[PDB]
Short mmCIF file of all heavy atoms in Angstrom, two decimals:
data_model
loop_
_atom_site.label_atom_id
_atom_site.label_comp_id
_atom_site.label_asym_id
_atom_site.label_seq_id
_atom_site.Cartn_x
_atom_site.Cartn_y
_atom_site.Cartn_z
N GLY M 1 0.85 -1.20 0.00
CA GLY M 1 0.00 0.00 0.00
C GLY M 1 0.88 1.24 0.00
O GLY M 1 0.77 2.12 0.85
N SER M 2 1.78 1.28 -0.96
CA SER M 2 2.77 2.33 -1.03
C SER M 2 3.08 2.57 -2.50
O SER M 2 2.76 1.72 -3.36
CB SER M 2 4.05 1.91 -0.30
OG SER M 2 4.69 0.89 -1.05
N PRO M 3 3.67 3.73 -2.80
CA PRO M 3 4.26 3.88 -4.11
C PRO M 3 5.24 2.74 -4.32
O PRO M 3 5.85 2.26 -3.36
CB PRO M 3 5.03 5.19 -4.00
CG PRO M 3 4.43 5.91 -2.85
CD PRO M 3 3.97 4.87 -1.91
N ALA M 4 5.38 2.29 -5.55
CA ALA M 4 6.39 1.30 -5.87
C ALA M 4 7.60 2.13 -6.28
O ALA M 4 7.61 2.76 -7.34
CB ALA M 4 5.93 0.38 -6.98
N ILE M 5 8.59 2.16 -5.41
CA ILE M 5 9.71 3.07 -5.53
C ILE M 5 10.85 2.37 -6.25
O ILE M 5 11.03 1.15 -6.12
CB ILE M 5 10.17 3.52 -4.14
CG1 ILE M 5 9.03 4.26 -3.44
CG2 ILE M 5 11.45 4.43 -4.19
CD1 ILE M 5 9.07 4.09 -1.89
N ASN M 6 11.64 3.14 -7.01
CA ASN M 6 12.81 2.61 -7.70
C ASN M 6 12.47 1.49 -8.68
O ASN M 6 13.23 0.54 -8.84
CB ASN M 6 13.87 2.15 -6.70
CG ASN M 6 14.52 3.31 -5.97
OD1 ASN M 6 14.95 3.19 -4.82
ND2 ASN M 6 14.60 4.44 -6.65
N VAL M 7 11.31 1.62 -9.33
CA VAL M 7 10.90 0.66 -10.34
C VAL M 7 11.44 1.09 -11.69
O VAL M 7 11.19 2.19 -12.15
CB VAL M 7 9.37 0.48 -10.44
CG1 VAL M 7 9.04 -0.55 -11.50
CG2 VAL M 7 8.81 0.04 -9.09
N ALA M 8 12.19 0.20 -12.31
CA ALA M 8 12.76 0.50 -13.61
C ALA M 8 11.67 0.44 -14.65
O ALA M 8 10.82 -0.46 -14.65
CB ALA M 8 13.88 -0.45 -13.93
N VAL M 9 11.68 1.44 -15.52
CA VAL M 9 10.69 1.53 -16.56
C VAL M 9 11.42 1.80 -17.87
O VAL M 9 12.15 2.76 -17.98
CB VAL M 9 9.66 2.65 -16.30
CG1 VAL M 9 8.66 2.71 -17.43
CG2 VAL M 9 8.93 2.45 -14.97
N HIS M 10 11.20 0.93 -18.85
CA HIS M 10 11.78 1.13 -20.16
C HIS M 10 10.69 1.36 -21.17
O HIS M 10 9.72 0.62 -21.23
CB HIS M 10 12.60 -0.08 -20.56
CG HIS M 10 13.83 -0.26 -19.74
ND1 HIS M 10 13.80 -0.76 -18.46
CD2 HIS M 10 15.13 0.01 -20.01
CE1 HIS M 10 15.03 -0.81 -17.98
NE2 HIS M 10 15.86 -0.34 -18.90
N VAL M 11 10.87 2.41 -21.97
CA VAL M 11 9.91 2.76 -22.99
C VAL M 11 10.56 2.49 -24.31
O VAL M 11 11.72 2.86 -24.54
CB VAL M 11 9.50 4.24 -22.91
CG1 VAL M 11 8.36 4.52 -23.87
CG2 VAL M 11 9.12 4.60 -21.49
N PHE M 12 9.81 1.82 -25.18
CA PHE M 12 10.28 1.53 -26.51
C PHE M 12 9.26 2.04 -27.50
O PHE M 12 8.07 2.16 -27.19
CB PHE M 12 10.48 0.02 -26.71
CG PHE M 12 11.34 -0.63 -25.67
CD1 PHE M 12 10.78 -1.07 -24.46
CD2 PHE M 12 12.71 -0.82 -25.89
CE1 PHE M 12 11.57 -1.68 -23.51
CE2 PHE M 12 13.50 -1.41 -24.93
CZ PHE M 12 12.93 -1.85 -23.74
N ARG M 13 9.75 2.35 -28.69
CA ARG M 13 8.89 2.80 -29.75
C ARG M 13 9.09 1.87 -30.93
O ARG M 13 10.23 1.52 -31.26
CB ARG M 13 9.21 4.25 -30.09
CG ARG M 13 8.25 4.84 -31.07
CD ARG M 13 8.73 6.20 -31.56
NE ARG M 13 7.84 6.62 -32.64
CZ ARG M 13 8.05 6.36 -33.92
NH1 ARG M 13 9.13 5.69 -34.31
NH2 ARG M 13 7.15 6.76 -34.82
N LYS M 14 8.00 1.42 -31.53
CA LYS M 14 8.07 0.54 -32.68
C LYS M 14 8.67 1.32 -33.85
O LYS M 14 8.16 2.39 -34.23
CB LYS M 14 6.70 -0.03 -33.01
CG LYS M 14 6.70 -1.32 -33.81
CD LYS M 14 5.44 -2.11 -33.46
CE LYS M 14 4.87 -2.88 -34.66
NZ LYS M 14 3.49 -3.37 -34.36
N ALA M 15 9.78 0.81 -34.36
CA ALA M 15 10.48 1.42 -35.48
C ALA M 15 9.79 1.07 -36.78
O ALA M 15 8.85 0.27 -36.81
CB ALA M 15 11.93 0.97 -35.52
N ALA M 16 10.28 1.67 -37.85
CA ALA M 16 9.78 1.41 -39.19
C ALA M 16 9.90 -0.08 -39.52
O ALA M 16 9.01 -0.63 -40.16
CB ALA M 16 10.53 2.26 -40.23
N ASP M 17 10.98 -0.71 -39.08
CA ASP M 17 11.22 -2.12 -39.39
C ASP M 17 10.46 -3.07 -38.45
O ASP M 17 10.76 -4.26 -38.38
CB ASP M 17 12.73 -2.44 -39.40
CG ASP M 17 13.39 -2.23 -38.05
OD1 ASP M 17 12.71 -1.77 -37.11
OD2 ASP M 17 14.59 -2.55 -37.91
N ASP M 18 9.48 -2.51 -37.74
CA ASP M 18 8.65 -3.26 -36.78
C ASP M 18 9.37 -3.81 -35.56
O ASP M 18 8.79 -4.60 -34.82
CB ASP M 18 7.84 -4.36 -37.47
CG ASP M 18 6.39 -3.99 -37.62
OD1 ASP M 18 6.10 -2.83 -37.98
OD2 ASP M 18 5.52 -4.86 -37.35
N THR M 19 10.62 -3.41 -35.36
CA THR M 19 11.34 -3.73 -34.14
C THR M 19 11.08 -2.67 -33.07
O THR M 19 10.72 -1.52 -33.37
CB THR M 19 12.88 -3.81 -34.37
OG1 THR M 19 13.39 -2.51 -34.68
CG2 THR M 19 13.22 -4.79 -35.50
N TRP M 20 11.27 -3.05 -31.82
CA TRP M 20 11.19 -2.12 -30.72
C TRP M 20 12.49 -1.37 -30.61
O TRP M 20 13.54 -1.97 -30.48
CB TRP M 20 10.88 -2.85 -29.43
CG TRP M 20 9.51 -3.34 -29.43
CD1 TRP M 20 9.09 -4.63 -29.52
CD2 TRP M 20 8.32 -2.53 -29.38
NE1 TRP M 20 7.72 -4.69 -29.51
CE2 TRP M 20 7.22 -3.41 -29.42
CE3 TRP M 20 8.08 -1.15 -29.30
CZ2 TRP M 20 5.89 -2.96 -29.39
CZ3 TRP M 20 6.77 -0.70 -29.27
CH2 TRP M 20 5.69 -1.60 -29.31
N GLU M 21 12.42 -0.05 -30.69
CA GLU M 21 13.58 0.77 -30.48
C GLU M 21 13.46 1.39 -29.11
O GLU M 21 12.37 1.83 -28.73
CB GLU M 21 13.70 1.85 -31.55
CG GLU M 21 14.15 1.31 -32.90
CD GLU M 21 14.59 2.41 -33.84
OE1 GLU M 21 14.30 3.60 -33.56
OE2 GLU M 21 15.22 2.10 -34.88
N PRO M 22 14.56 1.41 -28.35
CA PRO M 22 14.57 2.07 -27.06
C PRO M 22 14.20 3.52 -27.24
O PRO M 22 14.75 4.20 -28.12
CB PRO M 22 16.03 1.94 -26.61
CG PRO M 22 16.53 0.73 -27.34
CD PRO M 22 15.88 0.85 -28.68
N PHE M 23 13.25 3.98 -26.43
CA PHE M 23 12.77 5.33 -26.53
C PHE M 23 13.18 6.16 -25.31
O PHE M 23 13.71 7.26 -25.41
CB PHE M 23 11.25 5.32 -26.73
CG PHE M 23 10.65 6.68 -26.78
CD1 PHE M 23 10.74 7.43 -27.96
CD2 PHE M 23 10.04 7.22 -25.66
CE1 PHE M 23 10.21 8.72 -28.02
CE2 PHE M 23 9.50 8.51 -25.70
CZ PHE M 23 9.59 9.27 -26.87
N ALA M 24 12.94 5.61 -24.13
CA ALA M 24 13.31 6.30 -22.92
C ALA M 24 13.20 5.33 -21.79
O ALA M 24 12.52 4.32 -21.90
CB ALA M 24 12.38 7.54 -22.65
N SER M 25 13.85 5.64 -20.68
CA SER M 25 13.75 4.79 -19.53
C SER M 25 14.04 5.63 -18.32
O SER M 25 14.56 6.75 -18.41
CB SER M 25 14.72 3.60 -19.62
OG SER M 25 16.05 4.06 -19.62
N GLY M 26 13.67 5.09 -17.17
CA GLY M 26 13.79 5.81 -15.94
C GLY M 26 13.39 4.91 -14.80
O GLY M 26 13.10 3.74 -15.00
N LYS M 27 13.45 5.48 -13.60
CA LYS M 27 13.12 4.81 -12.35
C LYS M 27 11.96 5.56 -11.74
O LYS M 27 11.93 6.78 -11.79
CB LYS M 27 14.28 4.94 -11.37
CG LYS M 27 15.48 4.10 -11.69
CD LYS M 27 15.08 2.65 -11.69
CE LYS M 27 16.14 1.79 -12.31
NZ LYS M 27 17.20 1.40 -11.38
N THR M 28 11.01 4.85 -11.13
CA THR M 28 9.99 5.54 -10.33
C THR M 28 10.66 6.17 -9.11
O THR M 28 11.64 5.65 -8.59
CB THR M 28 8.83 4.66 -9.90
OG1 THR M 28 9.33 3.62 -9.04
CG2 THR M 28 8.14 4.04 -11.11
N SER M 29 10.15 7.32 -8.70
CA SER M 29 10.68 8.04 -7.57
C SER M 29 10.07 7.49 -6.28
O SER M 29 9.39 6.46 -6.28
CB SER M 29 10.31 9.52 -7.70
OG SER M 29 8.90 9.67 -7.60
N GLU M 30 10.30 8.22 -5.20
CA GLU M 30 9.75 7.87 -3.91
C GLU M 30 8.22 7.99 -3.94
O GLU M 30 7.54 7.40 -3.12
CB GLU M 30 10.35 8.74 -2.78
CG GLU M 30 11.84 8.48 -2.53
CD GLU M 30 12.49 9.56 -1.66
OE1 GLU M 30 12.42 10.75 -2.00
OE2 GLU M 30 13.10 9.21 -0.62
N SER M 31 7.69 8.72 -4.92
CA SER M 31 6.23 8.86 -5.01
C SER M 31 5.65 7.78 -5.93
O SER M 31 4.45 7.79 -6.26
CB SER M 31 5.86 10.25 -5.53
OG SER M 31 6.39 10.45 -6.83
N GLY M 32 6.51 6.86 -6.36
CA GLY M 32 6.14 5.82 -7.31
C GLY M 32 5.94 6.39 -8.70
O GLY M 32 5.41 5.74 -9.58
N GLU M 33 6.42 7.62 -8.90
CA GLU M 33 6.21 8.28 -10.18
C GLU M 33 7.47 8.43 -10.99
O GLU M 33 8.56 8.59 -10.45
CB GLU M 33 5.54 9.64 -9.99
CG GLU M 33 4.16 9.51 -9.38
CD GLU M 33 3.48 10.83 -9.20
OE1 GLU M 33 4.17 11.86 -9.17
OE2 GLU M 33 2.25 10.83 -9.07
N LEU M 34 7.28 8.38 -12.29
CA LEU M 34 8.37 8.53 -13.22
C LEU M 34 7.98 9.63 -14.16
O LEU M 34 7.11 9.45 -15.00
CB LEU M 34 8.59 7.24 -13.98
CG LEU M 34 9.63 7.23 -15.10
CD1 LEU M 34 10.89 7.99 -14.72
CD2 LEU M 34 9.95 5.80 -15.38
N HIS M 35 8.63 10.77 -13.99
CA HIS M 35 8.39 11.95 -14.79
C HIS M 35 9.60 12.18 -15.67
O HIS M 35 10.69 11.66 -15.38
CB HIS M 35 8.18 13.16 -13.88
CG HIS M 35 6.86 13.15 -13.18
ND1 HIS M 35 6.69 12.58 -11.93
CD2 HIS M 35 5.65 13.62 -13.55
CE1 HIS M 35 5.43 12.71 -11.57
NE2 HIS M 35 4.78 13.34 -12.53
N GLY M 36 9.41 12.95 -16.73
CA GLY M 36 10.53 13.39 -17.57
C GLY M 36 11.10 12.29 -18.44
O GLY M 36 12.26 12.36 -18.85
N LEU M 37 10.29 11.27 -18.74
CA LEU M 37 10.74 10.22 -19.64
C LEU M 37 10.99 10.80 -21.00
O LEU M 37 11.94 10.42 -21.67
CB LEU M 37 9.74 9.08 -19.80
CG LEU M 37 9.76 8.00 -18.72
CD1 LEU M 37 8.50 7.16 -18.85
CD2 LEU M 37 11.03 7.13 -18.85
N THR M 38 10.14 11.74 -21.40
CA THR M 38 10.26 12.28 -22.73
C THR M 38 9.78 13.70 -22.82
O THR M 38 9.47 14.34 -21.82
CB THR M 38 9.52 11.39 -23.73
OG1 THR M 38 9.87 11.80 -25.05
CG2 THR M 38 7.99 11.48 -23.53
N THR M 39 9.75 14.21 -24.04
CA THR M 39 9.32 15.56 -24.25
C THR M 39 8.24 15.54 -25.30
O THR M 39 8.06 14.54 -26.03
CB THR M 39 10.49 16.42 -24.76
OG1 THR M 39 10.93 15.90 -26.02
CG2 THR M 39 11.66 16.39 -23.76
N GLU M 40 7.52 16.65 -25.35
CA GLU M 40 6.53 16.94 -26.36
C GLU M 40 7.09 16.79 -27.79
O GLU M 40 6.41 16.30 -28.68
CB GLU M 40 6.01 18.36 -26.09
CG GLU M 40 7.08 19.38 -25.61
CD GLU M 40 7.85 19.00 -24.32
OE1 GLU M 40 7.32 18.30 -23.44
OE2 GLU M 40 9.02 19.44 -24.18
N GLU M 41 8.35 17.18 -27.97
CA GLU M 41 9.06 17.11 -29.26
C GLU M 41 9.45 15.68 -29.60
O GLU M 41 9.31 15.25 -30.73
CB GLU M 41 10.34 17.96 -29.24
CG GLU M 41 10.11 19.47 -29.25
CD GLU M 41 9.73 20.01 -27.88
OE1 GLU M 41 10.18 19.42 -26.86
OE2 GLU M 41 8.98 21.01 -27.82
N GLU M 42 9.91 14.94 -28.60
CA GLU M 42 10.41 13.61 -28.84
C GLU M 42 9.29 12.59 -28.94
O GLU M 42 9.42 11.58 -29.63
CB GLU M 42 11.37 13.23 -27.72
CG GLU M 42 12.06 11.91 -27.92
CD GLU M 42 12.92 11.55 -26.74
OE1 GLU M 42 12.36 11.30 -25.63
OE2 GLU M 42 14.15 11.52 -26.94
N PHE M 43 8.20 12.85 -28.24
CA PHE M 43 7.12 11.88 -28.10
C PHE M 43 6.16 11.99 -29.27
O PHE M 43 5.04 12.47 -29.14
CB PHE M 43 6.40 12.06 -26.77
CG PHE M 43 5.46 10.93 -26.42
CD1 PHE M 43 5.89 9.61 -26.46
CD2 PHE M 43 4.16 11.20 -26.03
CE1 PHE M 43 5.03 8.57 -26.14
CE2 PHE M 43 3.29 10.16 -25.70
CZ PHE M 43 3.73 8.84 -25.76
N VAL M 44 6.62 11.52 -30.42
CA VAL M 44 5.87 11.62 -31.65
C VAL M 44 4.86 10.50 -31.71
O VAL M 44 4.81 9.65 -30.81
CB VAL M 44 6.81 11.55 -32.86
CG1 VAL M 44 7.67 12.79 -32.90
CG2 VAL M 44 7.67 10.29 -32.79
#
């Protein structure tokens, strides 16, 4: 009954060749939150 802290999160984006390309990754914080994975520009 707590934030899940220090949880690794990997984001991938499907490439043109239908493979998963690494997009962004991060760790959940003490609030169980992971912010700043990407940007408005990058998150197409």
Side-chain angles (χ1 to χ4, degrees):
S2 70
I5 299 149
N6 290 150
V7 181
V9 179
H10 292 76
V11 188
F12 307 86
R13 187 189 172 269
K14 202 152 145 193
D17 63 356
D18 255 42
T19 67
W20 289 110
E21 286 194 346
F23 178 79
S25 64
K27 287 299 167 85
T28 63
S29 66
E30 293 167 305
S31 62
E33 297 181 340
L34 175 41
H35 287 91
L37 277 166
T38 191
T39 62
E40 38 302 331
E41 289 79 31
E42 185 184 67
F43 192 51
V44 292

